Structure 1
Amino acid sequence: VTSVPGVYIEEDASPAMSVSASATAVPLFVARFTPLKPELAGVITRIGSWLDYTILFDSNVPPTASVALRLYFQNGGGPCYLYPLEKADDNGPLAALPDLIDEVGEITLLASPDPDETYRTAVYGALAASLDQHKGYFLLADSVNGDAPSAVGGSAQVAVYYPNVEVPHTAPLSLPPSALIAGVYGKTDGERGVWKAPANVVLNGVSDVSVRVTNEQQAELNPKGINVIRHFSDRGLVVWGSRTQKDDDDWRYIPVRRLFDAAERDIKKALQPMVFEPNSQLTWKRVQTAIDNYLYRLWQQGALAGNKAEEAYFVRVGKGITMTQDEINQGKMIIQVGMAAVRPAEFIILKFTQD
């Protein structure tokens, strides 16, 4: 390698890496629209605000897609995507939908602001298969009446908000609340973070609910877990309840589901540069450290429910532990990692005593 005496120059190259967090926001909407140019017919388009929506698209006169989308920006900011399609049973682009979401790496939430039931349930079954290979989605849904929809029967990532919300327009028109409830997830992760359940947040700009729910049938609907939009006298309308669908003690809460969904997506994006490196011992201690310094920063900002000890993570990557010799030959690595998330506090009980 060295023949002429001279002086040779050489550096040490290494893929040494660290992990940084992205945002859990900016969904796409699959309602019907009216594009202005023919290349905007069937492709995903990034929308930054309400201003550039008025340039690319239009507001028509009879027509609820332009009304349901401006209520998204009044609640919480952030960009959003949209996928215009015209026919509900057009299973051409509906089959060609899930292989367009994967090429954009960010997509987290999923929604559909279209009013009727025949259009929404055709959508919810089209991309229902793309939820169980663990890439990181979390959709929203609405209920046509007092029970949950059956297009997605039992899954760890859905959320149902029962009573639909109306809005005045020149008779006031109703609106399925899956549109404007996506914007209220964009405020909670701003100041409070991911690990806070959005309940006490106040809906920003509405007249009234369509049907008035009371506390005696709140008792029935809070099991078989579906959420509810409530009305109060002093503070107006407010969202209420933060429970997911399937009710084992594994994941019954929205933030405990969404905390593990965001912690995986940040470490999986940064291990992708190191995917063909040798399986020696100095690679093991460099990966185990960059995961250790990610959960420790997240622990000391109040998101892992551990006490003043260290017991919130046990990431280990060794060869005697967690592996053995014969799966090195069919090249593998095993990352046993585990957290201890925090639960929301509901049902506060006082129990006064005399002494």
Structure 2
Amino acid sequence: WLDFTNLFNAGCIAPIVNYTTSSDALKLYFQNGGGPCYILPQLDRLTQGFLDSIPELIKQALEITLIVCPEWDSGYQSKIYNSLTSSLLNAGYFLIADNQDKNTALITEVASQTATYYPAVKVSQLIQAEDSQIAVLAQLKEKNPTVYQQAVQKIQAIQDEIAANGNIIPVSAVMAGIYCATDASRGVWKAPANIVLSGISDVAERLTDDEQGEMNSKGINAIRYFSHKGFVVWGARTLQNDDNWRYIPVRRLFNAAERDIKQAMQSVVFEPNSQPTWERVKSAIDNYLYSLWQQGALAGNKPQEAYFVQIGKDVTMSDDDIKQGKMIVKVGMAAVRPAEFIILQFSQQ
């Protein structure tokens, strides 16, 4: 957060007028254990050129894993989400989105790589900045107070509406910090739910058990308040409802394993395609998966039930593939799913 302040002008007013929750949202992200992040500032009107460059700019930064739009306007968020090409999310990138409604779920280009949360969160005080921080105000005051008064009325008009309707912050920014905090404490295989939110005032709308059950089938993760625990995240499901990609930890664990292995294989892309190469490749992946299994990331009593790697002349490839330069490796992982429901069966035996 200190680094962000030294490089960006923290405030609730966009450069000149518009209202922005980005500065406040980033404060919540660091408050909830978030680590280093990347900022993609948008300047001037929302041109079509910016949309086309979004997948390109993200790919250049090699470490980016999660995509978040901390804006509050629903129309602005929809444009950003659609701008994400299917080839971007399918390459190992996870998107965190905010639902605009309790009843219907979001429409996403890649459902399996998206998590949706509801409702938004409230904070008591926003970040107010002096005139020297707002880009075009101190210079404008000394030059022409007449237009300065004109701008201030709109600024004051923005200020009281936010106070009246309450300080509503999109929740995706908060959840991104929870993802990093969970990954630091437990593994990526641990579901990011059942974690207490920090530095919050209230949720936008209270939910009941019956209401959440309606959304949980649709794939909308809920923010619930429990008296014994406080405000917690209650839900770990993506937007896809099949057996494979249903829970967030299962999908994100594969993204990590694929990206890590793919990065390691870049030093093998021209090695000889013979038996000695296959033995080294198999051992490297086997050791990596064995380490994951011992950390509890894979389900099984013995390694044969948790993971398997297959690479060989007649088990995975053939003579024609070798002649054409193809090297094929088969990797199987049995990820661990969260226990979304605990069922206690009491008998009098």
- TM-score between the two structures when normalised by the length of structure 2: 0.83
Moved over 4 A (4+): none
- Find the residue that maps to 2:60 and give its secondary structure: coil
Does residue 167 in structure 1 map to residue 161 in structure 2?
A: no
Query: Is the alpha carbon distance of 1:101 and 1:159 closer, same or farther for their aligned partners in structure 2, counting shifts above 3 Å?
Result: same
- The separation in 2 between residues aligned to 1:89 and 1:82, in whole angstroms, is 17
Q: Which residue number in structure 1 is paired with residue 268 of structure 2?
A: 274
- The separation in 1 between residues aligned to 2:262 and 2:67, in whole angstroms, is 21
Of 69, 88, 92, the residue aligned with 1:131 is 88
Does residue 301 in structure 1 map to residue 257 in structure 2?
A: no
Q: Which residue number in structure 2 is paired with residue 208 of structure 1?
A: 202
- The separation in 2 between residues aligned to 1:177 and 1:341, in whole angstroms, is 28
Letter in 2 for 1:116: D
Of 192, 196, 200, the residue aligned with 1:198 is 192
1:1-355 aligned at under 5 Å gives the runs 50-60=1-11, 62=13, 63-87=20-44, 89-131=46-88, 134-146=90-102, 147-150=104-107, 152=108, 155-169=111-125, 171=163, 172-308=166-302, 310-355=304-349
How many Å apart are 1:108 and its aligned residue?
0.4
- Find the residue that maps to 2:324 and give its secondary structure: coil
Partners of 2:34 and 2:176 within 8 A in 1 = no
Partners of 1:88 and 1:119 within 8 A in 2 = no
Partners of 2:99 and 2:220 within 8 A in 1 = no
Letter in 1 for 2:188: V
Q: How many residues align?
A: 304
- The separation in 1 between residues aligned to 2:258 and 2:264, in whole angstroms, is 10
- Find the residue that maps to 1:239 and give its secondary structure: strand
- Find the residue that maps to 2:28 and give its secondary structure: helix
- The separation in 1 between residues aligned to 2:212 and 2:111, in whole angstroms, is 23
Query: Is the alpha carbon distance of 1:201 and 1:216 closer, same or farther for their aligned partners in structure 2, counting shifts above 3 Å?
Result: same
Query: Bigger relative contact order, structure 1 or 2, given CA contacts below 8 A and separation 6+?
Result: 2
Task: Provide structure 1 residue ranges, at least 5 long, that are not aligned to the other structure.
Answer: 1-49
- The separation in 2 between residues aligned to 1:223 and 1:154, in whole angstroms, is 18
RMSD: 1.6
Letter in 2 for 1:271: M
- Find the residue that maps to 1:80 and give its secondary structure: coil
How many Å apart are 1:313 and its aligned residue?
2.0
- TM-score between the two structures when normalised by the length of structure 1: 0.82
Partners of 1:148 and 1:226 within 8 A in 2 = yes
- Find the residue that maps to 2:320 and give its secondary structure: helix
- The separation in 1 between residues aligned to 2:315 and 2:95, in whole angstroms, is 38
Bigger proportion of residues as helix: 2
- The separation in 2 between residues aligned to 1:231 and 1:209, in whole angstroms, is 8
Task: Provide structure 2 residue ranges, at least 5 long, that are not aligned to the other structure.
Answer: 14-19, 127-162
Q: Report the identity percentage.
A: 59
